[PDB]
Every structure is written in structure tokens, then in C-alpha cells.
Design an enzyme around this catalytic site. Sequence first.
Site, short mmCIF file in Angstrom:
data_model
loop_
_atom_site.label_atom_id
_atom_site.label_comp_id
_atom_site.label_asym_id
_atom_site.label_seq_id
_atom_site.Cartn_x
_atom_site.Cartn_y
_atom_site.Cartn_z
N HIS A 154 0.81 -1.23 0.00
CA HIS A 154 0.00 0.00 0.00
C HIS A 154 0.83 1.26 0.00
O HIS A 154 0.31 2.35 0.27
CB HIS A 154 -0.96 0.05 1.19
N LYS A 169 -8.42 13.85 5.50
CA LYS A 169 -7.49 12.71 5.40
C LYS A 169 -6.46 12.88 6.54
O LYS A 169 -6.37 13.97 7.11
CB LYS A 169 -6.78 12.65 4.04
N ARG A 170 -5.69 11.84 6.86
CA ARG A 170 -4.66 11.98 7.90
C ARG A 170 -3.67 13.10 7.47
O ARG A 170 -3.48 13.33 6.26
CB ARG A 170 -3.92 10.66 8.14
N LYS A 185 0.65 14.31 1.63
CA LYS A 185 -0.70 14.72 1.26
C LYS A 185 -0.81 16.24 0.96
O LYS A 185 -1.77 16.67 0.29
CB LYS A 185 -1.67 14.25 2.33
N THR A 218 -8.60 6.74 -1.27
CA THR A 218 -9.99 6.25 -1.38
C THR A 218 -11.05 7.31 -1.02
O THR A 218 -12.16 7.28 -1.55
CB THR A 218 -10.20 4.97 -0.63
N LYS A 246 -14.85 8.53 -2.54
CA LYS A 246 -16.06 8.80 -1.77
C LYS A 246 -16.68 10.11 -2.26
O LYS A 246 -17.91 10.23 -2.43
CB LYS A 246 -15.75 8.85 -0.28
O1 LIG Z 1 0.10 2.89 6.78
C1 LIG Z 1 -0.62 3.06 5.81
N1 LIG Z 1 -1.76 3.85 5.96
C2 LIG Z 1 -2.63 4.06 4.87
O2 LIG Z 1 -3.63 4.77 5.00
N2 LIG Z 1 -2.32 3.50 3.63
C3 LIG Z 1 -3.21 3.77 2.47
O3 LIG Z 1 -3.79 2.62 1.84
C4 LIG Z 1 -4.94 2.96 1.16
C5 LIG Z 1 -5.58 1.57 0.95
O4 LIG Z 1 -5.00 0.91 -0.17
C6 LIG Z 1 -4.46 3.72 -0.09
O5 LIG Z 1 -5.60 4.27 -0.76
C7 LIG Z 1 -3.59 4.90 0.29
O6 LIG Z 1 -3.09 5.56 -0.84
C8 LIG Z 1 -2.50 4.54 1.32
O7 LIG Z 1 -1.84 5.74 1.81
C9 LIG Z 1 -1.18 2.73 3.49
C10 LIG Z 1 -0.31 2.50 4.57
I1 LIG Z 1 1.37 1.23 4.25
#
Ligand SMILES: O=c1[nH]c(=O)n([C@@H]2O[C@H](CO)[C@@H](O)[C@H](O)[C@H]2O)cc1I
Lengths: 807, 807
Positions: A348, A539-540, A545, A647, A651
Amino acid sequence: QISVRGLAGVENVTELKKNFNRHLHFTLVKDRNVATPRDYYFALAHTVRDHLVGRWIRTQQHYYEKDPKRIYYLSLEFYMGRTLQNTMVNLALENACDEATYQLGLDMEELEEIEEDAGLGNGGLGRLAACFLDSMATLGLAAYGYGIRYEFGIFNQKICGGWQMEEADDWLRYGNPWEKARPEFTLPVHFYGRVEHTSQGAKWVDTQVVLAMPYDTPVPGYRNNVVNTMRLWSAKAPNDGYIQAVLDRNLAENISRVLYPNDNFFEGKELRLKQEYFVVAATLQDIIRRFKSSTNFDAFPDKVAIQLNDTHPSLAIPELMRVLVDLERLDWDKAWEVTVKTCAYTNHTVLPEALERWPVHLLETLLPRHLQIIYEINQRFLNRVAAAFPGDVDRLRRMSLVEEGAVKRINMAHLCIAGSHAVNGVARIHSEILKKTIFKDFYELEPHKFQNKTNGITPRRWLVLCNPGLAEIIAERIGEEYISDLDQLRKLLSYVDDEAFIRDVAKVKQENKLKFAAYLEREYKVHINPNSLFDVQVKRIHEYKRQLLNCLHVITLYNRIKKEPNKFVVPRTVMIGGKAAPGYHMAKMIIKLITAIGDVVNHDPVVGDRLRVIFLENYRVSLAEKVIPAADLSEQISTAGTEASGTGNMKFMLNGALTIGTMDGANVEMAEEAGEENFFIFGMRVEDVDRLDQRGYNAQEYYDRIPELRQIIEQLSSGFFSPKQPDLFKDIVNMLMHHDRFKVFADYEEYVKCQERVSALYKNPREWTRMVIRNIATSGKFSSDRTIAQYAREIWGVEPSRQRLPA
Amino acid sequence: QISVRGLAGVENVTELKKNFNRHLHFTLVKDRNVATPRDYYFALAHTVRDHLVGRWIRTQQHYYEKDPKRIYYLSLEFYMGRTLQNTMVNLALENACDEATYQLGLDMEELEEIEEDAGLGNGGLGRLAACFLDSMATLGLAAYGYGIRYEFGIFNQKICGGWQMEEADDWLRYGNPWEKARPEFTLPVHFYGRVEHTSQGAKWVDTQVVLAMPYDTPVPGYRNNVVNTMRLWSAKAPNDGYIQAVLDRNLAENISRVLYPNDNFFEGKELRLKQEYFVVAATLQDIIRRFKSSTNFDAFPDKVAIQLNDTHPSLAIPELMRVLVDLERLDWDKAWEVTVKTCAYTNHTVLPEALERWPVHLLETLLPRHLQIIYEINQRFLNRVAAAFPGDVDRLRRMSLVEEGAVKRINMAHLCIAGSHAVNGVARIHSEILKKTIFKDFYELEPHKFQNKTNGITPRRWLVLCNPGLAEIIAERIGEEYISDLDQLRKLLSYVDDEAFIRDVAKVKQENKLKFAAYLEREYKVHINPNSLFDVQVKRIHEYKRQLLNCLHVITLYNRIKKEPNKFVVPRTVMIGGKAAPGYHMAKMIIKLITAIGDVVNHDPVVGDRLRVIFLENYRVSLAEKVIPAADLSEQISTAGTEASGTGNMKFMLNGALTIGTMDGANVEMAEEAGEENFFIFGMRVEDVDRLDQRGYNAQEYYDRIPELRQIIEQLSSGFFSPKQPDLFKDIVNMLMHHDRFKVFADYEEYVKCQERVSALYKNPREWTRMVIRNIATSGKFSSDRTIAQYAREIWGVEPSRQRLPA
Ligand SMILES: O=c1[nH]c(=O)n([C@@H]2O[C@H](CO)[C@@H](O)[C@H](O)[C@H]2O)cc1I
Ligand SMILES: O=c1[nH]c(=O)n([C@@H]2O[C@H](CO)[C@@H](O)[C@H](O)[C@H]2O)cc1I
């Protein structure tokens, strides 16, 4: 009231009110005069839970008899959110319970606000796991989510003087009606000890035992009567001066106490590795136990699939080897074959700081046998590499599962690739990046392993549940079938020129804004103009980001207002929200910057209600369910190459916001699906970022050539935004100027211009909405049902089925 | 089957089976094919619990409307045992559920064995609290038991090589169906801080806050539909690096984690004092909260009674003062008047080692305000003493709440006497001892405070529930009314010469022995002769209880057998059981001695089945419910003056065992009630012990004059009972010879002789049983209903009522 919400039978409403009063009386031991809304929530919660159980027992029975292949989804995170509405939605009880409760003189929506989020995850990855479970049940797969039952989830975020304060998310305080403790299936998990060699192979001895107790939570598919199981393990001490011995039991149980709050960042802490081993050990025994209740492991891969959600459960691999080799006495090579055919791995990220690399001195103490197995896996693997690229000593050192240096580390991603038959990224551009960069060597070895599975979200939570208005007007036109077949949304394309649909799509949006603007004022002292464009970035908080880029736009709009005050601007409410990991210093400063900007901007009388900057406290799933339907503009502005998929971006597309974004992650496929004319793309592509890296990124260049940008930095440097601490933001200016890994200044010009274009379209309501329709109408691809059907056919080898089971 | 067990309606049995299947399915989420006996227990448990709730809500409602005076029973211990059978008994469901479950193809008695004991207490004092609650509900008083919900109760006892091993009593592992969490009534409790003085009096500040969450458990009266409440507090951390902060919450919650296992022995540990303050702080707020929901504290004593179970909750006194003076702003003198009229104190010991004396340096750190209040209480009190006995500086120092010495201590008993309007002992001889010795000074000041309330047990658990056979044959003759009016047992005296009653009383006993002898073999490898006299001593292991005396008798019987092997002896199974506190070294040795004697005696072929010595593992409430009905001889052999009352002694009298005992505690009143001819009394009276203390006790004297005793000591000294460790018991011989505070040797002659008389009566079955009848027929006085009615009239000022509430 609305059609997508099911029937209100005369029999169903009557039954619901009698069970509600039963639970109130028998289960909650309250009566009508002492009961609070919280008691009412619970009575309803038990009453809906009653409708699941029949189906749950019946689904688990079916699987026992049909004996299909089983999917096991291992994750350290399941970001579930609230359960009640989702359960009602999936069972077609929403309108019944609404009627039943109104008749009892209650407001169900007010009752819904009482449920705690299950915040057992950090953000994207945890929430993907949750969407995936909904999709797996809806597609009738015999799928099990396994994880840890954390006693404390992601911390609740408070702002205090504009700084984040963390407090403990004590989500179980009042009990969780959804789960069922299963103490009868408690299993031992071993730690420390040492390794002995006999005539009969290795033995792992003198271990500390921790017990793993499971809690099962039902996962209902969408109107197919399938109810799958999510099993979460809790840590318990075994039963064997005295006072102190009893109190010390806590040490053992600390394993499942709290979720690590670091997202997209690896922290190499022991407690974390214990958690990782914990869920993996208990889960495999449970998997194998189930497999034996059908000696012969040849068919194990025809009966079991194990999906690794990132490298967090990578110990599945040496642990399955351990069980197969040491306990079942299979020879190494056959075990390995079984393992590789059983496991698959989803990556990811490509961020170096996010990849797990465990110090060897840790694994040795904690898991001395697994280290041995890992060394053996490494040796045999490198022999394949050497045999295939003879003389390439550099590839050998790059591909090693073991990294050399000041401390030896195990690279867990290398372990997962070696021991899995499929490896996949989570959006098409991200799968290409893996093949071209960090796993290029691996791909050259086994091209057949590498795949793509572009992420999706569930349209149940993300449309039907959080946005019934829009789901309703879509339903009027095209029926309801699209809820489990989101591709049907294309049909809406023949309504783009329909004056009545246009008017209805705009109206649904205006209502969600009116509601959200109220929710803002009722729960916090605010006042926002609901005619403004709602510009939201939720988002975090992370450097990649680029919340900071958003801040520079906001500062720019404000400086331009102050320069020509009586010029017309399209007014805006900029909302930015998300949590920072407690140790991420920079992230915490960005939150401070954001609120510091709101203190100046929101009180300037010259600015009017033309510009409002809000930081949205405690971003979490149930807050996402409200702000997303109210959004006009979605900010998806990560530096090209860093957002693996995203994601939230989906949404917002699904809920009628337009997207301003870089060509990153799944943004690339969203724009391809809607057409690039229907998307606001700006900034560097991946190739451009690399050109920049080769020359070298010098931020001074942008500061010297862009006077508007220079002014902002000067305002930041001199204390314009922190009048009592002139130097509050020297860290930010410093980083932006000398070590920005994410090239904020390089995208600034092009972002501002693209923002002017958004403003221009917003001035023409009708054309804004037509573009909205063109987005919503092409979001079908980003349904997690599509995603899971791809995993099912191309990785797990099972056939999805949309066939009902009987009730 | 049997009449005292209620009706089995055709409607009641049918209803019970439908709710059982409902709970199995909905609550337990099991189906008929996967369910274990444990699931069946739970289904039945929820099904019986359903019958309580209606009555519970209705009782709490009644009290709200009638507004009677409320009794609060504060105790650190509630030794409850199992709840299910007791609940069935009190509600008249026993025969229905038995039928209902048999029809479902289940054995209810087998289901009952699955329930954990609530072992929230150590022995006598904890169990008195439990009997008292049953009696208070049966007598319709508006009474509340308050305590702590320990996560771990008294440890489970394992024997290993004849030594005790402790393991954790994890009684909540599978959940507790009887309790109801009430998180909505959570209350703060403060610790540490410091004291500030304003213009407006003292303020307690910078405190650590611990939250107290209540769990309510129903307490059903015997067939009157009264259901009272037992409220137990649990410790929770408040919500306000990060990982470590979350894990540290445990420190705060440790307060309610574990019950201190020291019985009749004070340990001055901080954790203990926190527990004591914890239950007292949360309880008073809850009491006062309830009082305000009817400003004026004059009527507080007409609305509230607080009963202190020993000095464990003595902080009630300065805490009520604290609340009244600092928070409500009453002047000191009026507050004090209110306090004294509200509180009463029951003392349960005269053993110096058992009395609480808290180091001042503890109270100062933990509770700096209470120390101040205590000093003030002390000053004003000593002024009353000085005024009443002027010039008596010695009385002043003896009566002080503060003891001087190496460390200053607060004597908590002195606090309780000063701040209570009534002080009572727990048997008549023990109340006289208090007035003549340790509280002589106090009594001379306020003779009106001192009272007696001889202990009792509940005939529900202690007869109807654990001995249905005997309850049944009593019922045939005299009806059922005696279950709530135990005095009616006198009527049985006209049946002493009845050949059929004789035969039936003997038969009930023979059956209980046959069952218990089986239970012995089934759960442990044993083999016992069920024709033998069953000689049982069950109670916590303590020097004052004189298990060692029993051992010397057992050793003597064995030596005499070995001397004349072919002489007839009345055969015996000697059973001794009980737990030792983990730090009580001597106590642990006695257990070892006991088993060491069983290893020699139980394998001597010459001995036959004439003598068997058994140590009964894990003595606890539910084990008491089995061994007591099987007992022929009850050993109650404490040194005169040391057993405050005893209550096991009453359990055995009620269940047809004869008593060999010293004139101690309630033994004195039991023998007076049955007549001394119907009791085997031996040994020193209290007066004799004092004569001995004045001369001085020299054990050598008995060793020189009694050859049978000399031989035993020699066997002990030389390794006859520990052949591999000749010196194992040098500690015991040493203590017995040089520092026996309890004068074992002084009572030995007279005990052996009295034991010969028991044996002689046992040879004549008919005359044994007639004496049994004379005991059972005079046990009426020792009903806790009698006891509570005395507290109610003479201390609390409420009128008991046996009137039904409607269902
Ligand atoms: O520690 C993590 N935390 C997250 O939120 N993701 C996320 O994983 C999501 C699920 O695939 C992705 O959409 C996103 O781009 C990615 O940042 C991956 C890790 I590795
Ligand atoms: O710590 C204690 N543990 C007890 O079991 N008791 C018992 O209290 C019982 C209840 O009154 C008495 O029968 C008994 O004689 C006495 O020993 C008292 C204390 I103080």
C-alpha cells in the site's frame, strides 16, 4: 419515507416495537421513566442484532456443508465506524425501524448519533479492510476478517489553543452490542523461549504463553442474507508477591490494549511486533483447526486463501512454515509450495519511511525460530536469484531479505514477495511504479507474480447510507439494482441534459450543505455561509498529502481579497481536517498553522463571509459520513507518485463533489473514467518529479520568481499569523525552503490557476451540476464490489455469486 | 419431584422451555448441535434472570414511592458463591426448571456445576455479609450491599506434593449473567493532592481522580417478590509517550483488581487502603445523591443507616464529615451529630494481629484531609474523656485514636467507636470480652453504645438449597413455614421418640454421605468407607482455629491402632480443609503436615479402612454446600476466647452433624440451646486460659506428663512423617514447644477423651440420631433472619415485614 430504505410492513413494525420494549425491560433493566437516549439506542441495537443472528448461524452452517474455499483477510486494522445504520441498510429494516421508533415517540436519527465508532484503524488502509468485508459478504464469498480487538482505537482529537490534544478512545465503556465473546475458542500464542534441535528437528521451548480469546462480529451482505464473520483477538494471561503476580497479568494483556497511531510511517517498537505476531499466531491455528474439520496439506491451497493487508501480518509466512515443518513434519520443500500457493500480498506504499524493516536483534529475542526460518527462506531464495542472474552480486545484495548496515534488518516486503504467489498494488499507476522502481529486481525474477487491483469503496455506506437523498433521486430514474452493481450508474449519462434531474442533483447537494452547516453551528460555535463553495480536504495529516499546499492557496485568496477588497470573489468555506500521529512533529505544526490561519481570516471584517477557514476536529469515519455528502470540491493534491491509491477521492466522486487533483494514485483512473475535461488536474506528473530530482529541487527558485508566494513566506516568517510568537512557524518556512521532500513550491503556480478555473465553473450553477452528473455517472469502477471480484478471480480462484440464501 | 421445590405448572414449564431456546439462539448465538453444557448453563441462567428483572424494577420503584429508611451495608467482602440455584429457590422455580430442562433432555444438576463461585470474600466475615443480604431481602428491608467488584477473588487452591499452590480465580472469564453494568452512574474518587485553607474553610486540591463504575446484582428475598440490590464498584481511569500513557491507565484500575487474601490478619499495604477508601468514597456520594432525590441533613439519620462490617470501611466516618463540613458547609458539631446517628460498627475480632492500625505516613500522603479530620475527631473526643475521668492521663493515652511509638498509627477501631452510635460483637461471649478487655475504657465512657448481635446463617442456602432431602422430611412433618421462621424447628422435638422420623433423619444423612463419597472418587482418586464417622474441620487455616490439635488426635488414633491392631475401633474419615493466606508461613506448613499424615495413614495396610485422612482441596462456598450435609462430626475447637462467633458451626448444627467444641464464640449459645448433654464440650473455658496466662504457659509440662503426646512430638521431630526430609516440621515442633500462643497441648488430654465419647455414641446409631434430632430441632436461633431483625429494631430503627409485594 424514501424508497431505497425498504418496506414498513404492518407486521414488521409491530414486531419491532415489541422486541424493543422487551430489550428495554429484560436486557437493559430499565423502564420507560428512567431510560435515557443511550438506553433507547441499546434497545434498538439489540433489536436489530436479533435479525442478524438467525442469518449468521445459517451462513456458518452453509459453509460447513458446501465446504467452499475460504478467504482469510489478515489486517492490523479494520476501520469499521458505526454498525447500526449499516446493519439496517443491509437487511432492509431502515424504514421499518424508523416507523417502529417514531410510533414509540423516538427519533431514530438522534438515536444513531449515540453509537461509538469502532475506530480500530488509522485511515485509508484500515478503512479499505472495512469496505472489503462489506463487499465480500455482498458477493457471497466464504470470507473471514481477522484482526486484534484493541481496547483503545485511534485517539479522539481535541483542539486546544489551536494545538491537537490526544485523548483515549474508550469505545467499549458502555459495551459493544455487536460482538460475541467466544472464550471457548481461546488459543495459546508463544513468545521468547529458545530453539532446541533433536534427532526429530527443531523444537521451540521455554516460551511465555499469552492466550488469544476471539470476539466475533457479524458482517451482513447487502440483502442476500449472507452474514460473514469478523474475528478479533484479545490478549489474556494464563492462570498460573502474590498481589504483584496478579497485577502483573496486565503485562501480558497489554498486547491488545491500544492501536498504534502512526499511519504511513514505520515505528520499530517491540509492543508492535508482539501485536503483529499475536494476530498471526492465533489466526493460523484457527485456520488450520477449521481445515482439519472437513494429514493432507496438498489440498490446503485449494481450501485456504490468506490475504496480507500490507506487510503487517507478514509473519504469516514463516509461521505457516513453522507449523508445517516443525509441528506437522512436512519436508521443507513441500511446505514452501503450500505456503506460496496459500498467501498473497498487497503493498500500500512506496514511501521509504512507511516500509517495515525489523531489527534482527528484535526478532531473535522475541521469535528465535522464525528468524531461523527467515534465514533459510533467504538462502534458498538467493540461490534462485544467483542461478537466474549469475555473477550479479549487486542484485543479490539488493534482493536479500536481510539488509546489512549499522543494524541488520529484515525487510518484510521482500519476505512477502518471496513467499506469496501474487503481489499487487492498489491503483494502476502505483502497480507500475512498484514494477519500475522498488520491486524491479523482484519483477524481473517472477513477472507473473505482479498484478494490479485498483481500490474501491462500498456504495452501501458511501452512498445509500450517508446520502439517502441522492440515492433516492438516482433510484427514481434507474431503479435500485445499481446499489450492488454500481456500473449501472452510466445509465445516468442520458440525464445530463435533463432539466429536472439537474435541479434535483443540485437540490440534494444544497440540502446536505444546509444540514452540515447546521451540524457545524450546533456542535461548535462557527457560522458558515451555505451558499459558498465547500472546499474540503479530509485525510490523515502528512507531508506527502500536502495540506501545506492547500494552506498556501488559502493564504493567497486572502491576500488578494485584502489587496482589492471590493472586487467580487466566489466565496468559499475551506475545511481541512485529519489527525496527526502523536510523534509527528511537522504534522502537528501544520494543524497549528491551519487554525492560526482561521484566527486571522475568520475575524477580518473586510473579508466578510467570503472566506472561512475551518479545521474539522476529530476526523473519523462517522464524520466522513457527514462532510463528504456536503462537499463541492475534493482536494486530492499529493505529489505525483506518493498516494498509492487514495480512497476518500472515490467517496467524494460518488457523492457529487468535483475533484481538484494531481495525476496520482487512483486520480489517474477517475479522470480517465469521467474524461479529463470533467476533472481539475494540475501540476507535475510522475515523470516531471523525476526530472526535478535529477537536476535537484531548489525551492528558492520559486520564491524568487513568484511574488505572491514570496509575500506568504514573508508573512509566515515575520509573525503575521502568530503575532505573539513571531517565530512559531520557523520550522515550516525552514522545511519548505531547504528540505521539502514533497515539492510544495513546484506545484503552487499551477494549483492557484487551476483553482481559479474551479471558481469560474462554480459561477455557472447549471454547468457545475452537469459536470457533477458526469462524475457521479462514471464512478461505477470504484466500487469495492468490482475490486473484490477481481481478487476473487485473479488471485484467490473463487467465483463470486450474487445469489440469495433463504431466510 | 420434592415438595419444598415449588410447582411445575403446565404453563410454567412450557414458557421456560421457550425462553431457554430463545436465549440459546438469540443471546448465546449457538444452535442445538454446537452447544456445550456451558452454553446450556448460560441459556438457563438468562432464563431465570428474566424472572428477576420484573421484580427488581418493581422493588426499586416501591422504595422510591414509600420512601422508607435505607440500610447500607458496607463491606470489603461479599462471599456469594453460586447464584442460580439460590435464585430458583427464592422464586419457586426449582421444580419447573428441572422439569423444563429434563424435557429438553438436560440434567439441571449437571448444569449447576458449571457456574463459578463469586468468591469475593475470604471466609467468615465475607460470608456473613452474603447471608445478611439474603435475610434483609427476605425481611423486606430497603437494604443495599455496597462493595468492590474484584476482578479476581480468593485464589483457587491446588495441592502439589502436598503443598498449597495459589492460582488466580479468573471468575469473569466467561462473563457473569447476574450483573448489570451501570456506566451511567460513574462517580469520581480522589487521592493524594493536598489541603488548602481559604476564608471559606479547607479545600482538597491537586488530586488524582479514579472513576468508580457500579455493577448491580439482584438480591431476591424468599418468595416475597422483594429484589434488593448489591452494588459493586469497579475502578476506571479518567480519559485525559502516548502508548505508555494509555498502558498506564492500568495503574488506576488496579484498585479493584484483586481481593486481599489475608483473613483475620492485618497487612498495612497501600493498595489495600486505596481499596478501602475507594468503596467508601463512591458509596457515600451514591448514598447522598439518593438522599437528595426525596439541603436539610437533620433528617439524614431518619433516612439513612450505614453499617460498617468491621473496620474495613471505617473511612466512612471522616469521609461523611468531609462531605458535610467541606462540601455542604455544615458546622462541625451538627455534622458530627448526623454522622454518629448514621453509623454503626460491628467488630469481628479481638486478635491483636487482626486489628487495623494505619501508619500515619500513609494516610497523610494518600488522604491528607481525612488525617486532619481524624486529628480533630481525636482532640474533641479526648476532651470528653478528660472531662469525664479528670486526671486519668493513662486512660487518655489508651483511648487515643492515635497510637504513639516507632511509627504513629491510627487505631481504626477507636475511630469507629467514637463516630458510631452502636457497637456490637457477634456472639454473646465475644460481646462480653469486648466490654471487659479491649474496649473496657470505651464502654465505661458510653455503656449505651455496646450491644450484642449473635451471628446467624440463612436457612435458604444452608438448608433448603444444599440439603433438600432433610428439608423435605422436615416439611412432611411440620409444613414449610419454618424456612422463613426457623424457630418453628422446635416443633420437631415432639418427634424425637418417633421411629419413622429417626429412620428418615438417618437415611437422609446416609444418602448425603454416599453422594459425597462418590463426589470424592469421581473428582479425585480417593476411596473412602461411607460407613465411617465423617469427621470434618473446614474453615480458613489459622493457628487460633487449631487444626494442629485435630492433627494430634488423628496421629493418636493411628498410634493406638498400630499398638493394638486387632482391637475394634469406630472407623473414621477425617477431613480437614481450608485455604492459607499466601504469606502465612505456619499455616502453609500445617497444610503440609496434614497431607504428610494422609501419606502415612492412608497407605498403612494394617489400618485398613478404619482411618482415612483427607485434605479437602479448594474449600470454598460451593464445596461447603456439599461437605456440610455429609458431615457427622463438626470440629469447632478454637482456644476459648479467640473465635469471635464462628458460623460454619451453625451450618453443621442445621444439617445434622454433632459438634465437638470448646466453649468459644457462638458454641456457647448453641449448647445452651440444645442443652449441654447434646453437645461434646471439652477443654479450657476463657477463665482457665487467663489463669494459665498469669502463671505462664509452659508446654514442656504436658510433654513430660503425657506419654502419648511425647511419642507424637518424637515422631514429628525424627522424620516419621517426612522420611526424606527428617527436619521438615522442626518449625511446628518448635512453635508447639516454645511459642504456642494458642495452648494446643493444654487442651489435648481433654480433647482425646471427649473424642472417645463421640466414638461411643456413634456405636449406637439410634441414640446418635436422637441427639442429632435434638440439635437440628434447636438451631432456630441461628437463623440470620433472627439476627437481622435484631439489627433492624435495636440499631437501625426499622420494622421488619414478611409481607409479599405483588407480581
Ligand atoms: O500505513 C498506511 N496507511 C494508509 O492509510 N495507507 C493507504 O492505503 C490505502 C488503501 O489501499 C491507499 O488508498 C492509500 O493511498 C494509502 O496511503 C497505506 C499504509 I502502508
Ligand atoms: O478478617 C476476618 N475474617 C473473618 O472470617 N472473621 C470472622 O467473622 C465471622 C463473622 O462475624 C465470625 O463468625 C468469626 O468468628 C470471625 O473470625 C473476622 C475477621 I476481623
